[PDB]
Amino acid sequence: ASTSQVRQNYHQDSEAAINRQINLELYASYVYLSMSYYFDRDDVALKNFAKYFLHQSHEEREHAEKLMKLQNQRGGRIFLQDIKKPDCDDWESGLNAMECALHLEKNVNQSLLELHKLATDKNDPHLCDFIETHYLNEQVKAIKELGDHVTNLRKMGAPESGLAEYLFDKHTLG
Amino acid sequence: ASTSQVRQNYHQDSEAAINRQINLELYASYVYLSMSYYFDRDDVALKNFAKYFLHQSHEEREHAEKLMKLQNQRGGRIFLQDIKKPDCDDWESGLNAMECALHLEKNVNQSLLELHKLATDKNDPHLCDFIETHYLNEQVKAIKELGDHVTNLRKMGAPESGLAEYLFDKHTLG
Amino acid sequence: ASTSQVRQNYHQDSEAAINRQINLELYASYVYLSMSYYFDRDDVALKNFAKYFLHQSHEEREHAEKLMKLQNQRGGRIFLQDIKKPDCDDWESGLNAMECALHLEKNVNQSLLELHKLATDKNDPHLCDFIETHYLNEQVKAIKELGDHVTNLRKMGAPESGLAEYLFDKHTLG
Amino acid sequence: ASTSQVRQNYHQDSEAAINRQINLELYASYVYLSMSYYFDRDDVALKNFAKYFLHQSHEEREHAEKLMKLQNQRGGRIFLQDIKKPDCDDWESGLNAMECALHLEKNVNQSLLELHKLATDKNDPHLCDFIETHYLNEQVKAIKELGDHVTNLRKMGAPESGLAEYLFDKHTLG
Amino acid sequence: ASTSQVRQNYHQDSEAAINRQINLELYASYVYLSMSYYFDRDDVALKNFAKYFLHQSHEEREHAEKLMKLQNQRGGRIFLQDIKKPDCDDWESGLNAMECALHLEKNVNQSLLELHKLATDKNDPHLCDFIETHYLNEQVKAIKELGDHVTNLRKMGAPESGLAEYLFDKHTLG
Amino acid sequence: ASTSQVRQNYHQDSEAAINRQINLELYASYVYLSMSYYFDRDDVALKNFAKYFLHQSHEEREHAEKLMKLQNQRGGRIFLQDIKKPDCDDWESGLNAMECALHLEKNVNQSLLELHKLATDKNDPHLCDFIETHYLNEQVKAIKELGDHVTNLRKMGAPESGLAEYLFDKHTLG
Ligand SMILES: [Cl-]
Ligand SMILES: [Cl-]
Ligand SMILES: [Cl-]
Ligand SMILES: [Cl-]
Ligand SMILES: [Cl-]
Ligand SMILES: [Cl-]
Ligand SMILES: [Cl-]
Ligand SMILES: [Cl-]
Ligand SMILES: [Cl-]
Ligand SMILES: [Cl-]
Ligand SMILES: [Cl-]
Ligand SMILES: [Cl-]
Ligand SMILES: [Cl-]
Ligand SMILES: [Cl-]
Ligand SMILES: [Cl-]
Ligand SMILES: [Cl-]
Ligand SMILES: [Cl-]
Ligand SMILES: [Cl-]
Ligand SMILES: [Cl-]
Ligand SMILES: [Cl-]
Ligand SMILES: [Cl-]
Ligand SMILES: [Cl-]
Ligand SMILES: [Cl-]
Ligand SMILES: [Cl-]
Ligand SMILES: [Cl-]
Ligand SMILES: [Cl-]
Ligand SMILES: [Cl-]
Ligand SMILES: [Cl-]
Ligand SMILES: [Cl-]
Ligand SMILES: [Cl-]
Ligand SMILES: [Cl-]
Ligand SMILES: [Cl-]
Ligand SMILES: [Cl-]
Ligand SMILES: [Cl-]
Ligand SMILES: [Cl-]
Ligand SMILES: [Cl-]
Ligand SMILES: [Cl-]
Ligand SMILES: [Cl-]
Ligand SMILES: [Cl-]
Ligand SMILES: [Cl-]
Ligand SMILES: [Cl-]
Ligand SMILES: [Cl-]
Ligand SMILES: [Cl-]
Ligand SMILES: [Fe+3]
Ligand SMILES: [Fe+3]
Ligand SMILES: [Fe+3]
Ligand SMILES: [Fe+3]
Ligand SMILES: [Fe+3]
Ligand SMILES: [Fe+3]
Ligand SMILES: [Fe+3]
Ligand SMILES: [Mg+2]
Ligand SMILES: [Mg+2]
Ligand SMILES: [Mg+2]
Ligand SMILES: [Mg+2]
Ligand SMILES: [Mg+2]
Ligand SMILES: [Mg+2]
Ligand SMILES: [Mg+2]
Ligand SMILES: [Mg+2]
Ligand SMILES: [Mg+2]
Ligand SMILES: [Mg+2]
Ligand SMILES: [Mg+2]
Ligand SMILES: [Mg+2]
Ligand SMILES: [Mg+2]
Ligand SMILES: [Mg+2]
Ligand SMILES: [Mg+2]
Ligand SMILES: [Mg+2]
Ligand SMILES: [Mg+2]
Ligand SMILES: [Mg+2]
Ligand SMILES: [Mg+2]
Ligand SMILES: [Mg+2]
Ligand SMILES: [Mg+2]
Ligand SMILES: [Mg+2]
Ligand SMILES: [Mg+2]
Ligand SMILES: [Mg+2]
Ligand SMILES: [Mg+2]
Ligand SMILES: [Mg+2]
Ligand SMILES: [Mg+2]
Ligand SMILES: [Mg+2]
Ligand SMILES: [Mg+2]
Ligand SMILES: [Mg+2]
Ligand SMILES: [Mg+2]
Ligand SMILES: [Mg+2]
Ligand SMILES: [Mg+2]
Ligand SMILES: [Mg+2]
Ligand SMILES: [Mg+2]
Ligand SMILES: [Mg+2]
Ligand SMILES: [Mg+2]
Ligand SMILES: [Mg+2]
Ligand SMILES: [Mg+2]
Ligand SMILES: [Mg+2]
Ligand SMILES: [Mg+2]
Ligand SMILES: [Mg+2]
Ligand SMILES: [Mg+2]
Ligand SMILES: [Mg+2]
């Protein structure tokens, strides 16, 4: 029951919201892992799409670990939940995977914006600064990058043009 | 429906057993992640226990990735399931965590031995060699290491001796 | 007549099966040599297809040499047969050559799997280990690579698109 | 009485067979030590024969140590027996010593093949892989090398030609 | 049917004669491969004879490849035939193998001299220069080397003297 | 029967005493090998005790080899006997093993002192110098080191204190 010796200005609602965000980052890690190995299939065979999404996957795990570190720094207690399987097994195309990644990153951003609103409501400037420093601009850059990629693949003629996804794999992701 | 152009001598039962093993490796990764951050709590504060279990966690993710690579190499299709949360939130002590890790690694080994029996039953010598090369001796070394650690912590007087877990953290894990 | 001073646990059927496999590896070497120089024709002119298949050809010769070394290591006696000319003089296209190479590598794999079954039947664990160590995973990687290449060429629009085979030559094989 | 915390899938018969093999490797070490110092006698005086057999002797000790390490890795218990003196004090000639070494290495190989059959019978794929990885191909190479040496010494005119054993000592073992 | 865009002054008889020579070079490659592994037998065991003939074998493959390159350079079309097994399985002795290699190299030279006569008859100075530059002096050097080796082995007392072949292996081929 | 051409001032009793000492050094090597792998057990798990005794074991083998070299230098003839298994399978504790090693080294020293008395009685100053140079001060240093180790382990509270043996392993043997 008794309070952590380190805990100060750290609301129970913020503690719970941080545990929810840890789960979402691990979910995103899992989604990108699934997408990566789709592109390693012998009937898809786009190795730089596979490498790009595997790197994305490793970055999400790092995002989760930093939130776990934060939870302990502030004297909250980590509570883990199941990591749900991704919505899709078959990602259809390079373009569709990039569109799904854009959607994932905007949903993660919306979660972080809700987290920041809560930290603002509870007058937790350390937690506001943590989210702003480590997460919000990373999300803005990730979303911009994925939008750029979706744009190029559409302009090149994906997903009908297998030549488009092949040349994008070599010139943008390679 | 139609068969992968690469698939040869790769039974549907082996394909399914590989997907089950991918889930178990990701589960083990999650268990070690949970254990790691327990030792980063301000009321536990054993930083080399935390580092040791985080490294274990990263190794399990690599074990899962190599099985995903194998699935595609042989022309099977990855099917992911939810990654269950670990059995414990509170791991009690350095000794208890090490005993739980020993139990986890023996359960993963038993799964791999069942997988090898199936590959033997289906006359899949490539899959037998894959399991023997990349997994069986890694498990034997992991189990031996964890047994050694449990032995030292017990002999030192853990878990009642907080001095024992502190000195083990510095001299064996540091 | 009299037995080799080194021979131990090496069945006459295994000895004969090794000589058959030596011939098949030299045949595969010859098939890839033929394919290589097709791409060096002035009316085909895909230099990285030519280089890729020449390297394949040199690797098959190395596969044959290692089996010849094995035969002598175990005290069997090499018996050579004619190396048959390849089935084709004209390989039609980059895509068709890659499809023929995939077929060749799956036939060589099937031969090696029959060889392993025989070594298992004759309780020859050294020969089983030799095949697993030096051949089975090399075949699995070769087949996966060729499947990936066939997939990309088809998606790019080969064989009708001469642009597809030209750009594949530069970006994947170059 | 109670079971090792590490032990899994490790039959008592395999444990005993490993202890027998440890003794045989130490015996082989002793045989090669005896042979080495025969060639250091002032009335034999073949220094590269002496060096060759001393290196052989050190390799057998390493073979024994790795089996001792395996016994503990799998949670079996080492049981040592007397190391019998070699069959001979006087090895007669370079050729006779090489013929005795060929016989020793084939007997050690036969022991390892019996060990592998037992591990196969007890469905111990880790132990099968251990024997295949560390022992079976080392034996095949050792036996082939000794056969080659016996062949050269016989062709040169040993053991009647002291010139043959002298020139072999310099050109093959030196 | 229609003519290569590159073809100029290249008679159909020269084109056919080049295909015959490609087969003979691949045959010679095969003969030297067979001879090499004879010397790797445990009951022959002359490792520098084995290395010498393996290098010879690799040089013949290079001779064949350069003729394949020539065929395409001049706009002819490669036509491959079966590579016949060597005349012998058992080469008897170092001296006999060297005598067989001398005979092989003189037969290859006679083929090249017939090829040059044809190129002269068809007023093909490029093909005459190609044969003179890349083949005729290589044959003269190869034949002289093999004659020197046969001479030394005979003078040393081969094939009855196993000491002769052993010392030649070390001092000339080593 | 007839005498070695090198033999001078080398009594048959000294020759026999040297063969007895060769056996005792090989016995000591075996005792330290057994002790080493006791500390590699998963239920003992003191890796620097294991390393220390393995090094001791290798030093005893070197002691035996130097006596074998001496036997031949002086024109005596090596006669080997069985190497008896150690008195213990289970060495109980770090302290007990160190006490057993102290006892072993004092027994080996007593043997060497008897050997020196015999060499003195037979007026063999070369053999006296050999024993003094290579053995007597090595024994005195070994005995002093083991006494120091026994003293520290007792003062630290071994064998009841598992913490004592763990910290000794790290700070003295590590
Ligand atoms: Cl608070
Ligand atoms: Cl609160
Ligand atoms: Cl990464
Ligand atoms: Cl605030
Ligand atoms: Cl940023
Ligand atoms: Cl940006
Ligand atoms: Cl920015
Ligand atoms: Cl391009
Ligand atoms: Cl299949
Ligand atoms: Cl199936
Ligand atoms: Cl790591
Ligand atoms: Cl099988
Ligand atoms: Cl391993
Ligand atoms: Cl280990
Ligand atoms: Cl190991
Ligand atoms: Cl046999
Ligand atoms: Cl047979
Ligand atoms: Cl190459
Ligand atoms: Cl078997
Ligand atoms: Cl491989
Ligand atoms: Cl691969
Ligand atoms: Cl691989
Ligand atoms: Cl068991
Ligand atoms: Cl049992
Ligand atoms: Cl050595
Ligand atoms: Cl098995
Ligand atoms: Cl090996
Ligand atoms: Cl070999
Ligand atoms: Cl080898
Ligand atoms: Cl023309
Ligand atoms: Cl013409
Ligand atoms: Cl070469
Ligand atoms: Cl002319
Ligand atoms: Cl030249
Ligand atoms: Cl010359
Ligand atoms: Cl010249
Ligand atoms: Cl004397
Ligand atoms: Cl005397
Ligand atoms: Cl050492
Ligand atoms: Cl004296
Ligand atoms: Cl000293
Ligand atoms: Cl001292
Ligand atoms: Cl001193
Ligand atoms: Fe994230
Ligand atoms: Fe794992
Ligand atoms: Fe300390
Ligand atoms: Fe091959
Ligand atoms: Fe051995
Ligand atoms: Fe040639
Ligand atoms: Fe000693
Ligand atoms: Mg959620
Ligand atoms: Mg990202
Ligand atoms: Mg709480
Ligand atoms: Mg669900
Ligand atoms: Mg989507
Ligand atoms: Mg910033
Ligand atoms: Mg950052
Ligand atoms: Mg499961
Ligand atoms: Mg691990
Ligand atoms: Mg399916
Ligand atoms: Mg649940
Ligand atoms: Mg537990
Ligand atoms: Mg291994
Ligand atoms: Mg590995
Ligand atoms: Mg065939
Ligand atoms: Mg290949
Ligand atoms: Mg035969
Ligand atoms: Mg035909
Ligand atoms: Mg085909
Ligand atoms: Mg096997
Ligand atoms: Mg392998
Ligand atoms: Mg290889
Ligand atoms: Mg025995
Ligand atoms: Mg050896
Ligand atoms: Mg027992
Ligand atoms: Mg006896
Ligand atoms: Mg003998
Ligand atoms: Mg191997
Ligand atoms: Mg080894
Ligand atoms: Mg011909
Ligand atoms: Mg030549
Ligand atoms: Mg034509
Ligand atoms: Mg014929
Ligand atoms: Mg001939
Ligand atoms: Mg010239
Ligand atoms: Mg040249
Ligand atoms: Mg004694
Ligand atoms: Mg000592
Ligand atoms: Mg005597
Ligand atoms: Mg006894
Ligand atoms: Mg004792
Ligand atoms: Mg004195
Ligand atoms: Mg001194
Ligand atoms: Mg000394």
Numbering used by the authors:
A (entry chain AAA), B (entry chain AAA), C (entry chain AAA), D (entry chain AAA), E (entry chain AAA), F (entry chain AAA): 3 to 176
Verbatim from the authors:
In eukaryotes and in some bacteria Ft is made-up of 24 subunits that naturally self-assemble to form a nanocage structure. The cage has octahedral symmetry, with external and internal diameters of 12 nm and 8 nm, respectively. H chains exert ferroxidase activity and have a high affinity for the TfR1 transferrin receptor, over-expressed on the surface of different cancer cell lines. Homopolymeric Fts constituted by human H chains (hHFt) are considered very promising nanosystems for drug delivery.
